[PDB]
Coordinates of N, CA and C and ligand atoms in Angstrom, one line a residue:
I1 N 92.2 91.0 109.8 CA 91.5 91.3 108.3 C 90.3 91.2 108.3
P2 N 90.2 92.5 107.7 CA 88.9 93.1 107.5 C 88.5 93.1 105.6
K3 N 87.7 92.2 105.9 CA 87.3 91.9 104.1 C 85.8 92.3 104.0
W4 N 85.5 92.5 102.9 CA 84.1 91.9 102.3 C 83.6 90.8 102.0
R5 N 82.9 90.2 102.9 CA 81.6 89.1 102.9 C 80.7 89.4 101.5
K6 N 81.4 89.8 100.5 CA 80.7 89.8 99.0 C 81.2 90.5 97.3
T7 N 81.2 89.5 97.3 CA 81.8 90.0 95.3 C 81.3 90.8 95.4
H8 N 80.2 90.9 94.6 CA 79.7 91.9 94.0 C 79.0 93.3 95.4
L9 N 79.9 95.1 95.3 CA 79.8 95.9 95.4 C 79.6 96.7 94.9
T10 N 78.4 97.8 95.5 CA 78.0 99.0 94.8 C 78.9 100.5 95.2
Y11 N 79.1 101.2 93.9 CA 79.6 102.5 94.4 C 78.6 103.6 93.8
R12 N 79.0 104.4 94.2 CA 78.7 106.4 93.7 C 79.2 107.5 94.4
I13 N 78.9 108.0 93.1 CA 80.3 109.7 93.2 C 79.1 109.8 93.5
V14 N 79.5 110.6 95.4 CA 77.9 111.5 95.5 C 78.5 113.0 94.9
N15 N 79.8 113.5 94.4 CA 80.1 114.5 93.9 C 80.9 114.9 93.2
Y16 N 81.4 115.9 92.7 CA 82.8 116.1 92.2 C 83.9 117.2 91.9
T17 N 84.7 116.6 91.9 CA 85.8 118.1 91.7 C 85.9 119.0 90.6
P18 N 85.8 120.2 91.0 CA 86.1 121.4 90.3 C 87.2 121.3 88.8
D19 N 87.7 120.1 89.2 CA 89.7 120.5 88.9 C 89.4 119.4 87.3
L20 N 88.5 118.4 86.8 CA 88.4 117.9 86.0 C 86.7 118.0 85.9
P21 N 86.8 117.4 84.0 CA 85.1 117.8 83.9 C 84.4 116.2 84.5
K22 N 83.4 116.6 83.9 CA 82.6 115.2 84.4 C 82.7 114.4 84.3
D23 N 82.9 113.9 83.3 CA 83.6 112.6 82.5 C 84.5 112.1 83.3
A24 N 85.8 112.7 83.0 CA 87.7 112.9 83.4 C 87.2 111.6 85.2
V25 N 85.9 112.6 85.8 CA 85.9 112.2 87.2 C 85.7 110.6 86.9
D26 N 84.4 110.6 86.4 CA 83.6 109.6 86.4 C 84.9 107.8 85.7
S27 N 86.0 108.1 84.9 CA 87.0 107.7 83.6 C 88.1 106.9 84.5
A28 N 88.2 107.9 85.6 CA 89.1 107.8 86.6 C 89.2 107.0 87.4
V29 N 87.4 106.4 88.0 CA 87.5 105.7 89.0 C 86.4 104.4 88.7
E30 N 86.0 104.7 87.0 CA 85.8 102.9 86.3 C 87.5 102.2 85.9
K31 N 88.0 103.0 85.4 CA 88.9 102.3 85.0 C 90.2 101.4 86.5
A32 N 89.9 102.7 87.6 CA 90.2 102.6 89.3 C 89.8 100.9 89.9
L33 N 88.7 100.9 89.2 CA 87.9 99.4 90.3 C 87.9 98.4 89.7
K34 N 88.2 98.7 87.4 CA 88.4 97.8 86.8 C 89.7 97.4 86.9
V35 N 91.0 97.6 87.8 CA 92.5 97.0 87.7 C 91.8 96.1 89.0
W36 N 91.0 96.1 89.8 CA 90.7 95.0 90.9 C 90.1 93.8 90.3
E37 N 88.4 94.7 89.1 CA 87.5 93.4 89.5 C 88.0 92.4 88.4
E38 N 89.1 92.7 87.7 CA 90.4 92.1 86.2 C 91.5 90.8 86.9
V39 N 90.9 91.3 88.5 CA 92.2 89.9 89.4 C 91.8 89.4 90.5
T40 N 90.0 89.4 90.3 CA 89.3 89.3 91.6 C 87.9 88.5 90.9
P41 N 87.0 88.0 91.6 CA 85.4 87.8 91.6 C 84.6 89.3 92.1
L42 N 85.7 89.8 92.3 CA 84.4 91.4 92.6 C 84.1 92.1 91.2
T43 N 82.9 92.6 91.8 CA 82.0 93.0 90.2 C 81.7 94.0 90.9
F44 N 81.2 95.8 90.0 CA 80.3 96.1 91.2 C 79.5 97.3 90.2
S45 N 79.4 97.7 90.9 CA 77.4 98.3 89.8 C 77.2 100.1 90.5
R46 N 77.2 100.7 89.4 CA 77.1 102.3 89.6 C 75.9 102.6 90.1
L47 N 75.7 103.5 91.4 CA 74.6 104.1 91.8 C 74.3 105.3 92.1
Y48 N 73.5 105.6 91.7 CA 72.8 107.4 91.6 C 72.2 107.6 92.7
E49 N 72.0 106.8 93.4 CA 70.9 107.4 94.6 C 70.9 106.6 95.7
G50 N 70.8 106.4 96.7 CA 71.0 105.7 98.5 C 72.2 105.7 98.4
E51 N 71.8 104.3 99.8 CA 73.4 104.1 99.8 C 74.1 102.9 99.3
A52 N 75.6 102.8 98.7 CA 76.2 102.3 98.5 C 77.4 101.6 99.6
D53 N 78.1 100.3 98.8 CA 79.1 100.1 99.7 C 80.2 101.0 99.6
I54 N 80.4 101.8 98.9 CA 82.3 102.7 98.2 C 81.3 104.0 98.1
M55 N 81.0 104.7 99.0 CA 80.9 106.3 98.5 C 81.7 107.4 98.1
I56 N 82.4 106.9 97.8 CA 83.4 108.4 97.2 C 82.7 109.7 96.6
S57 N 83.7 110.2 97.2 CA 83.8 111.6 97.0 C 84.9 113.0 97.3
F58 N 84.8 113.6 96.9 CA 85.5 115.3 97.5 C 85.4 116.0 98.3
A59 N 86.1 116.2 99.1 CA 86.3 117.1 100.4 C 87.2 117.9 100.7
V60 N 87.1 119.0 101.1 CA 88.7 119.8 102.1 C 88.1 120.1 103.5
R61 N 89.7 120.3 104.5 CA 89.1 120.1 105.6 C 88.2 119.0 106.7
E62 N 87.4 119.5 107.2 CA 87.1 118.9 107.8 C 85.5 118.3 107.0
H63 N 85.1 117.2 106.8 CA 84.2 116.4 106.0 C 83.4 115.5 106.4
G64 N 83.4 115.5 108.0 CA 82.5 114.1 108.5 C 82.9 113.0 109.2
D65 N 83.6 112.9 108.5 CA 83.9 111.8 109.6 C 85.7 111.5 110.8
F66 N 86.6 110.4 111.1 CA 87.6 111.4 112.0 C 88.7 111.5 110.9
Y67 N 88.2 112.2 110.6 CA 90.2 112.8 109.2 C 90.2 113.3 108.4
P68 N 90.5 114.2 109.0 CA 89.8 116.3 108.3 C 91.2 116.3 107.1
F69 N 91.0 117.1 106.6 CA 92.6 117.2 105.4 C 92.6 117.9 105.6
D70 N 94.4 118.2 105.4 CA 95.0 119.2 105.3 C 95.7 120.5 104.4
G71 N 95.0 120.0 103.9 CA 94.7 121.1 102.5 C 96.1 121.1 101.3
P72 N 96.6 121.7 101.1 CA 97.9 121.7 100.1 C 98.4 120.9 100.5
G73 N 99.2 119.5 99.9 CA 99.8 118.6 99.9 C 99.3 117.9 100.8
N74 N 100.6 117.0 100.9 CA 100.3 115.7 102.7 C 99.4 114.4 101.8
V75 N 98.4 114.6 103.1 CA 97.7 113.3 102.8 C 97.1 113.9 101.4
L76 N 97.2 113.2 100.5 CA 96.1 113.4 99.2 C 94.8 113.3 99.1
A77 N 94.0 112.4 99.8 CA 93.2 111.1 100.2 C 93.6 110.1 100.9
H78 N 92.2 109.5 101.4 CA 92.3 108.4 102.3 C 90.7 107.6 101.7
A79 N 90.9 105.9 102.2 CA 89.8 105.0 102.7 C 89.7 104.3 103.6
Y80 N 88.3 104.1 104.3 CA 88.4 102.5 105.5 C 88.5 101.5 104.9
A81 N 88.9 100.9 105.4 CA 88.8 99.1 105.2 C 87.0 98.5 105.3
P82 N 87.3 97.3 104.5 CA 85.3 96.3 104.5 C 84.5 96.6 105.4
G83 N 83.3 96.7 105.3 CA 83.1 97.2 105.8 C 81.6 98.0 106.3
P84 N 80.4 97.7 107.3 CA 79.3 99.0 107.5 C 79.9 100.0 107.2
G85 N 78.6 101.5 106.7 CA 78.3 103.1 107.1 C 80.0 103.1 106.6
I86 N 80.3 103.9 107.1 CA 81.9 104.7 106.9 C 82.4 104.1 106.1
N87 N 82.6 102.4 106.7 CA 83.8 102.0 106.4 C 83.7 100.9 104.2
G88 N 84.6 100.9 104.5 CA 84.7 101.0 102.9 C 84.8 102.4 101.4
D89 N 84.4 103.9 102.0 CA 84.1 105.0 101.4 C 85.9 105.6 101.4
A90 N 85.6 106.2 99.9 CA 86.6 106.8 99.4 C 86.6 108.3 99.7
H91 N 87.6 108.9 100.5 CA 87.4 110.3 99.9 C 88.8 111.3 99.3
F92 N 88.3 112.4 98.6 CA 89.7 112.9 98.1 C 89.7 114.3 98.4
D93 N 91.1 114.5 98.4 CA 91.6 115.5 99.5 C 91.3 116.4 97.5
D94 N 89.9 118.4 98.1 CA 89.8 118.6 96.7 C 90.7 119.5 97.0
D95 N 92.1 119.6 97.3 CA 92.5 121.1 98.1 C 94.0 120.9 97.1
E96 N 93.9 119.2 96.4 CA 94.8 119.0 95.5 C 94.5 119.7 94.0
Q97 N 95.0 119.4 93.3 CA 94.7 119.5 91.9 C 94.9 118.0 91.1
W98 N 93.4 117.6 91.0 CA 93.7 116.3 90.1 C 93.4 116.8 88.3
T99 N 94.3 115.7 88.1 CA 94.7 115.9 86.7 C 94.8 114.0 86.4
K100 N 94.5 114.8 84.9 CA 94.2 113.3 84.0 C 95.5 113.3 83.9
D101 N 96.5 114.7 83.2 CA 98.1 113.8 83.1 C 98.7 113.6 84.4
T102 N 99.9 114.5 84.0 CA 100.8 114.4 85.4 C 100.9 115.7 86.3
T103 N 100.3 116.8 85.6 CA 100.6 118.4 85.8 C 99.9 118.3 87.9
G104 N 99.1 116.8 87.6 CA 99.1 117.5 89.3 C 99.3 115.9 89.6
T105 N 98.0 115.3 90.9 CA 98.0 114.4 91.4 C 96.9 113.4 90.9
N106 N 97.4 112.9 89.8 CA 97.2 111.9 89.1 C 95.4 111.4 89.4
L107 N 94.7 111.5 89.3 CA 93.7 111.3 90.3 C 93.0 109.4 89.8
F108 N 93.0 108.7 88.3 CA 92.8 108.0 88.3 C 93.9 106.7 89.5
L109 N 95.2 106.8 89.2 CA 96.1 106.4 90.3 C 96.3 106.6 91.9
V110 N 95.8 107.9 92.1 CA 95.1 108.4 93.7 C 93.8 107.3 94.3
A111 N 93.2 107.0 93.2 CA 91.7 106.4 92.8 C 92.1 104.6 93.5
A112 N 93.1 104.5 92.1 CA 93.0 103.3 91.9 C 93.6 102.8 93.3
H113 N 94.6 103.3 94.0 CA 94.9 103.5 95.7 C 94.0 103.1 96.8
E114 N 93.3 104.4 96.6 CA 92.3 103.9 97.4 C 91.1 103.0 97.6
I115 N 90.7 102.3 96.1 CA 90.1 101.3 96.3 C 90.5 100.1 96.4
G116 N 91.6 100.4 96.6 CA 92.8 99.3 97.2 C 92.3 98.6 98.6
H117 N 92.4 100.4 99.3 CA 91.8 100.2 100.8 C 89.7 99.7 100.9
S118 N 89.9 100.2 100.0 CA 88.3 100.2 100.8 C 88.0 98.5 100.0
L119 N 89.1 97.3 99.9 CA 89.0 96.8 99.8 C 89.6 95.9 100.4
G120 N 90.2 96.1 101.1 CA 90.8 95.6 102.7 C 92.2 95.8 102.3
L121 N 93.0 96.4 101.6 CA 94.8 96.1 101.0 C 95.2 97.7 102.5
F122 N 96.2 97.0 103.4 CA 96.8 97.4 103.1 C 98.2 98.6 102.9
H123 N 99.3 99.1 103.3 CA 100.7 99.6 102.0 C 101.8 98.4 102.2
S124 N 102.6 98.6 101.1 CA 102.9 96.7 100.4 C 104.2 97.5 100.7
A125 N 105.4 96.9 100.8 CA 106.9 97.0 100.6 C 106.7 97.6 99.7
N126 N 106.5 96.7 98.7 CA 107.3 96.9 97.5 C 107.5 97.7 96.3
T127 N 109.1 98.8 95.9 CA 108.6 100.4 95.3 C 107.9 100.3 94.7
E128 N 107.7 99.6 93.4 CA 106.8 99.4 92.5 C 104.9 99.0 93.0
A129 N 104.5 99.1 93.5 CA 103.4 98.0 93.6 C 102.2 99.5 93.9
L130 N 101.2 99.6 93.5 CA 100.1 100.6 93.5 C 99.9 100.8 95.4
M131 N 99.8 99.4 95.7 CA 100.1 100.2 97.3 C 100.7 100.8 97.7
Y132 N 101.5 101.2 97.3 CA 102.6 101.6 98.3 C 102.4 103.1 98.7
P133 N 102.8 103.3 100.2 CA 102.9 104.5 100.8 C 103.1 105.2 100.1
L134 N 103.8 106.0 100.0 CA 104.2 107.6 98.8 C 103.7 107.0 97.9
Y135 N 103.4 108.7 97.4 CA 102.7 109.3 95.9 C 104.1 108.6 95.3
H136 N 103.9 108.6 93.1 CA 104.4 108.6 93.1 C 103.2 109.4 91.3
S137 N 104.1 109.4 90.0 CA 103.0 108.7 89.2 C 104.1 108.6 88.1
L138 N 103.8 108.5 86.4 CA 105.1 107.5 86.1 C 105.0 108.3 84.1
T139 N 105.7 108.2 83.6 CA 105.7 108.5 82.6 C 104.6 108.8 81.8
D140 N 104.5 107.2 81.0 CA 103.4 107.1 80.4 C 102.1 106.0 81.4
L141 N 101.5 107.1 81.2 CA 100.1 106.5 82.2 C 99.2 105.1 81.8
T142 N 99.6 105.3 80.2 CA 99.4 104.3 79.7 C 99.9 103.0 79.7
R143 N 101.3 103.0 80.5 CA 101.8 102.0 80.8 C 102.3 101.2 82.9
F144 N 100.9 102.0 82.6 CA 100.7 101.2 84.3 C 99.4 100.1 84.5
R145 N 100.0 99.5 84.9 CA 99.0 98.6 85.4 C 99.4 97.6 87.1
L146 N 98.5 96.7 87.5 CA 98.6 96.3 88.7 C 100.3 95.2 88.8
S147 N 100.7 95.9 90.2 CA 102.4 95.2 90.1 C 101.5 93.7 90.6
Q148 N 102.5 93.2 90.8 CA 102.7 91.7 91.5 C 102.1 91.7 92.4
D149 N 102.7 92.2 93.5 CA 102.2 92.3 94.9 C 101.0 92.3 94.7
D150 N 99.8 93.1 94.0 CA 99.5 94.1 93.9 C 98.3 92.6 94.5
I151 N 98.3 92.0 92.8 CA 97.9 91.3 92.4 C 97.9 90.3 93.4
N152 N 98.6 89.7 94.2 CA 99.0 88.1 95.0 C 97.8 89.3 96.3
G153 N 98.1 90.5 96.7 CA 97.4 90.8 97.9 C 96.1 91.0 97.8
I154 N 95.7 91.5 96.9 CA 93.8 91.3 96.5 C 93.0 90.0 96.1
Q155 N 94.2 89.0 95.6 CA 94.0 87.4 96.2 C 93.9 86.8 96.8
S156 N 94.6 87.0 98.0 CA 94.2 86.4 99.5 C 93.3 86.9 100.2
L157 N 92.1 87.7 99.3 CA 90.8 88.4 100.5 C 89.8 88.0 99.7
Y158 N 90.2 87.6 98.1 CA 88.8 87.7 97.8 C 89.1 86.3 96.5
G159 N 90.7 85.6 96.9 CA 91.0 84.8 95.2 C 90.3 85.4 94.3
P160 N 91.5 84.7 92.3 CA 91.3 84.8 91.4 C 89.6 84.6 91.5
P161 N 89.5 85.6 89.6 CA 87.9 85.0 89.1 C 88.1 83.6 87.8
Ligands
LIG1 CA1 79.9 102.6 102.9
LIG2 CA1 96.6 117.1 101.4
LIG3 CA1 91.2 121.7 93.7
LIG4 ZN1 87.4 111.1 105.0
LIG5 ZN1 97.2 104.5 102.0

């Protein structure tokens, strides 16, 4: 049961995708981190230089670690469980089309999902859970909220705020 031994994590957006403006990317990330920050003592802090606990980046096919990307479709991204170095990092396959709306793969939706892993959560059984295996969108992107199951999960590791 891997988990962070500290409630204050630091993140760094190594680079950006050509699909969205620099800002749409930062917002998706911040809104994704904030969903977990709200339901736990977890606190994130942005780093523009050096090594961060969660190294966020975009990439296609082979790109450093042990899990290459498969081009368009399928594995949209992935994250590593809590730990040192490569662990905790979140990588997004830039072979997909990251969108703020529902026209492609919603960056926020996936990012939130990935952070769930970087924090130590695996896939859930609940169909309407954020940590659900299969990626799907929603009609009102504004109506999204952490599913009950996700609350219980993230708190069993770090507890309530
Ligand atoms: Ca790391
Ligand atoms: Ca893919
Ligand atoms: Ca792309
Ligand atoms: Zn990767
Ligand atoms: Zn996943």
